[PDB]
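Q: How do we represent a protein-ligand complex in a form that can be generated token by token?
A: Start from the inputs.
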Amino acid sequence: NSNICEVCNKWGRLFCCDTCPRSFHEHCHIPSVEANKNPWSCIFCRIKTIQERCPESQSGHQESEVLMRQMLPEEQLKCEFLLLKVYCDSKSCFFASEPYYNREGSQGPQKPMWLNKVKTSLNEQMYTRVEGFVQDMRLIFHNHKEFYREDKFTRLGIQVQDIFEKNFRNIFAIQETS
Ligand SMILES: [Zn+2]
Ligand SMILES: [Zn+2]
Ligand SMILES: [Zn+2]
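Then emit the structure tokens for the protein with zinc ion bound:
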């Protein structure tokens, strides 16, 4: 197995996947690495299994249809994986914890949002449809773009949103377009 966490790229107390060479810190994995279960399969392996069991699941989909799906176990897992893919980018540190807003010439967002809040919301099964999860994820970056205005720091929101969106289109097999 790898000797660093797949998400944060640090060593430490790592739990190893039994079906692939990836490793994780306990709370870097989403959901948090389970207490027992030998063997243990990581979220990357669990997602691969879904695809292998239903190869047609990779045919193109309309975003509108994906968003309306109820959060049954497979959609739950897919949102957890997409959330994990965002944390895998080091620029996610900017969006992880609860933000605060005191900048001359800007007002804070009406509805602040951050990754750890989405993580808790998933854990607590607070989303009933994929749309709930996707809306809160997109809101993180929209809030950032609006607040930082013309500061070049706005680009961090664009960058991490692009990682979100590419992974969304991959995991949920959104129909490719020009
Ligand atoms: Zn880690
Ligand atoms: Zn694995
Ligand atoms: Zn099938």
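Residues 5, 7-8, 10, 25, 28 surround zinc ion (ligand 1) (CB under 6 Å). The chain has two domains: 1-59, 60-178.
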